[PDB]
Amino acid sequence: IPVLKEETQHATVSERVTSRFTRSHYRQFDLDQAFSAKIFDRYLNLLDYSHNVLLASDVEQFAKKKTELGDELRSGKLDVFYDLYNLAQKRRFERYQYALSVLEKPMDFTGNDTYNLDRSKAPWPKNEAELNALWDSKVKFDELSLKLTGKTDKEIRETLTRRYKFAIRRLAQTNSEDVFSLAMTAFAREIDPHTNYLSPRNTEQFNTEMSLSLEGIGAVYQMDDDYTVINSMVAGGPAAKSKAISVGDKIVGVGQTGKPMVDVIGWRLDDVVALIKGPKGSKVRLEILPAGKGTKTRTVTLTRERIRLEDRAVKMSVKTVGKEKVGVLDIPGFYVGLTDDVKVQLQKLEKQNVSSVIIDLRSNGGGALTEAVSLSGLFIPAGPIVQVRDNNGKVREDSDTDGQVFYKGPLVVLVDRFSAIASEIFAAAMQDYGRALVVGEPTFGKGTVQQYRSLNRIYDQMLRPEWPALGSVQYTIQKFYRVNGGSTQRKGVTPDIIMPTGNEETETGEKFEDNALPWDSIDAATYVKSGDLTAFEPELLKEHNARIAKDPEFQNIMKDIARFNAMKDKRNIVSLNYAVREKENNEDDATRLARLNERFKREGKPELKKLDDLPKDYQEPDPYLDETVNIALDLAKLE
């Protein structure tokens, strides 16, 4: 395999990269030895997430000088990363040699053995034997996954073999930029988890340009390990519009109209992503493992489009209970024109004489801070909305100037785990003004913005035919603050009323993220509260808690939360006993089929004969919305 080598331009990029982070990142940090040490470890974990490749012998050879990397990045002298990447690429190959062998060996799932899915805290293997034991276990796990999939012994040995060959092929497919990226990745993600190095565009982009404006599914992908994951969906992109794939789901397989389905376990991110993308109005076939460690996969077929703005658009509806009326705005995202679209929706809402109005920001990871401000100000007359703090410690206060409220009546803002930024600042501000009730779950808590700078400076193509282009940096320039003076960072907005889901722990939120910047305050801005809704909390809670206690969906929701607690201590570990696993799957299905048919009883639908039979258009009801409509009407009555 051609040995990977830093390219000439890399030197300067490193210098330029290090400049910007060191000096201009929101976070005032010391790129000292200690900092360097942590990077080193972070890089190691990139090379070998699973700590089942590198030999402990190898590790210390590089580890003894982990404090050098500060100066190394500054002087653009990066061979330490490259030598260690070239190692651990060598060793990765040793693994695949072994693993192919073990496929041949006959295998039985009769024994009571187990598999741990998190070796991130594990010991670095000490010797050949230990490697072979760990790799034996990986192969056994893969064979079983496919047996439970429903593949035959033969095709299991064939399909695993294919994957491992591609891993070897890939090993040689990678290149200098791939290494360098990864070095930057180690540096970037040690300042905070939203700082990034974005590699330049290659030939492949050029063909995108000869190709159309513009070709994707509006999901933002990254990678932990062998497995690709979704962090973000773009509002009104087909991913989001399908409502099938979600945040956190792992992608395992992609396909086209003619061709059979293609395994993407253990890839380079670029390669998985490339396979997805297609000419507009195309289709693509997608295969996902929901959440984590479900061990069951579903298929999602994406009508490839390019974002229709009416998919992007605010959607208005009017719910009714008895004779009472509740305007509902689903606002997908904080799009330009939101506040104007909203003003027009308020027009229809006054025709219909609604007694209260829900703003539904659920799974709305933001958009324009501009629009967030405008909207806040439709419900408060004039006043500050948000405090913006920059990479100089300077504070800007963004405010509404209308001395007008376009809608005066009660207001609920409904938020969840995945509500973010503009949603959070609007939700925060509605709380701080005591102008609305918040309902749902703790919000994501992303309280910072980033920006891109190009690494290209104007003189590069007068003084070079280096035209390899340089990449960009993306990094924290601002932290957002409430008008109460708390940041939304890590805590987000905590609703007045927590729906059942929000009373537990979770995998997700800015707070659970690797090295997220900590919560803090600044001094409260000066505002004119629009009312006080603390009087109303106990009767609101009392009736809310009562209603959902008698409610089938909330009852079911509770059990699945209770069950989650009861069994979640045993998540990391899976049985390698085939029949246990098949029984786990079978017990799932029974639970599921019973729960759906129960629903259909109450909905007056004909009951399901099998779970096999669920139509692939099938949508869940919305317990939270229904209940929030109720809370909204209570609130209207209370005033």
Side-chain angles (χ1 to χ4, degrees), residues 15 55 69 119 136 224 230-231 233 322 383 386 389 422 515 539 572 589 606 621:
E15 175 159 346
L55 180 59
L69 273 189
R119 293 188 48 68
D136 205 76
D224 299 299
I230 302 185
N231 259 340
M233 297 192 136
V386 67
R389 191 179 182 183
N515 281 22
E539 214 186 328
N572 258 345
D589 269 7

Side-chain angles (χ1 to χ4, degrees), residues 239-367:
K241 183 182 169 176
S242 75
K243 304 172 292 165
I245 298 181
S246 198
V247 172
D249 285 349
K250 313 298 198 293
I251 295 152
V252 284
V254 285
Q256 307 231 350
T257 329
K259 291 286 141 183
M261 164 82 75
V262 174
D263 181 345
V264 295
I265 294 176
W267 285 40
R268 155 159 97 158
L269 194 48
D270 210 79
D271 261 299
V272 184
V273 169
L275 280 176
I276 296 158
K277 294 173 100 176
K280 83 190 136 201
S282 159
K283 275 200 257 133
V284 69
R285 166 157 97 238
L286 264 174
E287 195 165 45
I288 55 146
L289 192 48
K293 307 170 173 83
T295 76
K296 305 176 79 201
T297 282
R298 64 193 177 207
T299 304
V300 176
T301 313
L302 266 185
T303 316
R304 202 204 304 276
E305 334 178 11
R306 159 216 74 164
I307 284 201
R308 306 324 150 143
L309 304 187
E310 295 309 292
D311 283 300
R312 173 202 91 191
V314 72
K315 297 256 159 133
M316 203 267 285
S317 40
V318 185
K319 306 298 162 131
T320 61
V321 184
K323 313 299 185 170
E324 299 160 339
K325 304 168 164 154
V326 170
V328 173
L329 315 182
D330 182 64
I331 293 163
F334 280 78
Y335 66 74
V336 184
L338 182 49
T339 293
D340 291 341
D341 289 347
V342 166
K343 276 163 190 187
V344 164
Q345 299 329 341
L346 294 177
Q347 205 108 41
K348 314 177 182 191
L349 290 172
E350 266 100 70
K351 271 172 16 204
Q352 318 273 250
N353 213 63
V354 311
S355 84
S356 68
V357 165
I358 290 154
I359 310 307
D360 191 344
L361 306 180
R362 279 178 294 172
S363 289
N364 170 336

Side-chain angles (χ1 to χ4, degrees), residues 83-325:
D83 288 332
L84 196 49
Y85 179 109
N86 280 303
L87 296 181
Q89 181 194 38
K90 284 200 161 229
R91 199 70 73 218
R92 197 164 281 247
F93 175 76
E94 275 191 358
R95 177 182 184 302
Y96 284 114
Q97 283 201 283
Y98 186 74
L100 291 154
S101 174
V102 170
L103 275 186
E104 214 169 335
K105 200 177 86 191
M107 293 181 275
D108 186 292
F109 294 103
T110 294
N112 309 308
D113 38 25
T114 61
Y115 190 86
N116 176 6
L117 286 153
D118 187 346
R119 293 188 48 68
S120 75
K121 325 255 192 226
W124 289 111
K126 327 279 182 151
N127 61 63
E128 162 199 355
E130 193 169 345
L131 283 178
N132 296 334
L134 285 170
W135 301 334
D136 205 76
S137 278
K138 182 56 160 104
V139 172
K140 188 150 156 195
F141 172 69
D142 285 358
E143 202 209 340
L144 179 56
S145 312
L146 298 168
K147 282 193 186 284
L148 295 165
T149 307
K151 310 294 179 206
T152 64
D153 304 343
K154 195 178 205 274
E155 81 187 280
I156 290 168
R157 305 310 173 89
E158 268 145 17
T159 315
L160 288 182
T161 315
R162 161 173 118 187
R163 183 190 308 155
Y164 301 159
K165 283 174 188 170
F166 288 149
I168 302 172
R169 212 169 174 119
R170 272 193 313 275
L171 203 71
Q173 284 192 24
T174 63
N175 68 34
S176 299
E177 176 58 25
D178 291 327
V179 183
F180 181 80
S181 267
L182 205 61
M184 282 307 101
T185 283
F187 180 15
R189 294 283 178 89
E190 188 48 57
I191 316 165
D192 80 33
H194 296 294
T195 306
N196 274 282
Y197 166 89
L198 296 92
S199 64
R201 310 171 189 127
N202 292 290
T203 304
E204 314 231 41
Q205 174 57 328
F206 176 89
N207 304 316
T208 302
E209 261 149 8
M210 273 309 117
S211 216
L212 312 192
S213 274
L214 198 64
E215 317 184 334
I217 55 150
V220 176
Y221 324 87
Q222 305 271 244
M223 198 161 258
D224 299 299
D225 58 20
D226 284 359
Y227 289 98
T228 302
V229 54
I230 302 185
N231 259 340
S232 172
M233 297 192 136
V234 182
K241 183 182 169 176
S242 75
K243 304 172 292 165
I245 298 181
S246 198
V247 172
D249 285 349
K250 313 298 198 293
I251 295 152
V252 284
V254 285
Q256 307 231 350
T257 329
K259 291 286 141 183
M261 164 82 75
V262 174
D263 181 345
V264 295
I265 294 176
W267 285 40
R268 155 159 97 158
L269 194 48
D270 210 79
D271 261 299
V272 184
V273 169
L275 280 176
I276 296 158
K277 294 173 100 176
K280 83 190 136 201
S282 159
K283 275 200 257 133
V284 69
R285 166 157 97 238
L286 264 174
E287 195 165 45
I288 55 146
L289 192 48
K293 307 170 173 83
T295 76
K296 305 176 79 201
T297 282
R298 64 193 177 207
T299 304
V300 176
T301 313
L302 266 185
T303 316
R304 202 204 304 276
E305 334 178 11
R306 159 216 74 164
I307 284 201
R308 306 324 150 143
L309 304 187
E310 295 309 292
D311 283 300
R312 173 202 91 191
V314 72
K315 297 256 159 133
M316 203 267 285
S317 40
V318 185
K319 306 298 162 131
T320 61
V321 184
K323 313 299 185 170
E324 299 160 339
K325 304 168 164 154

Side-chain angles (χ1 to χ4, degrees), residues 32-44:
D32 60 23
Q33 288 175 301
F35 204 89
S36 303
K38 314 195 164 225
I39 292 175
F40 178 81
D41 295 340
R42 185 175 296 283
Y43 185 63
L44 275 167

Side-chain angles (χ1 to χ4, degrees), residues 541-557:
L541 293 158
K542 167 187 173 210
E543 312 280 295
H544 164 66
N545 289 334
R547 283 181 309 252
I548 70 170
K550 80 178 164 163
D551 180 276
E553 301 299 347
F554 282 106
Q555 294 173 349
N556 296 337
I557 291 172

Side-chain angles (χ1 to χ4, degrees), residues 369-553:
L369 176 75
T370 255
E371 278 289 331
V373 151
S374 297
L375 182 61
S376 288
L378 290 206
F379 308 111
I380 70 169
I385 312 301
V386 67
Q387 319 199 47
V388 190
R389 191 179 182 183
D390 75 354
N391 57 343
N392 296 332
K394 194 217 125 100
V395 182
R396 190 189 82 211
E397 270 176 34
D398 279 9
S399 68
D400 190 55
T401 48
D402 267 350
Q404 289 147 25
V405 175
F406 281 87
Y407 173 74
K408 309 206 168 127
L411 189 61
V412 192
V413 173
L414 184 47
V415 299
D416 64 11
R417 234 165 282 220
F418 286 155
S419 296
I421 302 145
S423 315
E424 286 177 304
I425 282 159
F426 170 88
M430 284 303 82
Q431 209 171 54
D432 293 336
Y433 270 78
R435 172 63 184 89
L437 203 77
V438 180
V439 182
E441 313 172 331
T443 69
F444 194 82
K446 185 165 180 227
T448 60
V449 329
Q450 296 68 43
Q451 81 174 174
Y452 313 71
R453 294 285 164 211
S454 189
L455 291 164
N456 313 282
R457 297 184 177 156
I458 56 224
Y459 287 121
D460 296 347
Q461 295 273 275
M462 163 177 113
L463 322 179
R464 266 159 231 230
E466 281 182 350
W467 67 253
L470 312 189
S472 8
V473 285
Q474 176 178 51
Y475 54 83
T476 296
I477 55 167
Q478 294 166 313
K479 190 161 183 178
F480 276 140
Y481 288 89
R482 298 177 58 151
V483 284
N484 92 34
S487 170
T488 34
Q489 167 71 17
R490 290 189 73 122
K491 260 134 73 158
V493 190
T494 300
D496 293 310
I497 303 165
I498 306 167
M499 300 286 185
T501 297
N503 295 299
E504 301 300 304
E505 268 181 10
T506 176
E507 303 125 316
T508 89
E510 182 67 331
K511 77 193 325 137
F512 299 108
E513 282 270 55
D514 209 337
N515 281 22
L517 289 182
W519 192 72
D520 68 9
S521 85
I522 63 170
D523 283 287
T526 283
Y527 50 101
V528 156
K529 295 178 58 183
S530 52
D532 177 311
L533 285 198
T534 56
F536 301 179
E537 289 203 67
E539 214 186 328
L540 284 166
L541 293 158
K542 167 187 173 210
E543 312 280 295
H544 164 66
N545 289 334
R547 283 181 309 252
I548 70 170
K550 80 178 164 163
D551 180 276
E553 301 299 347

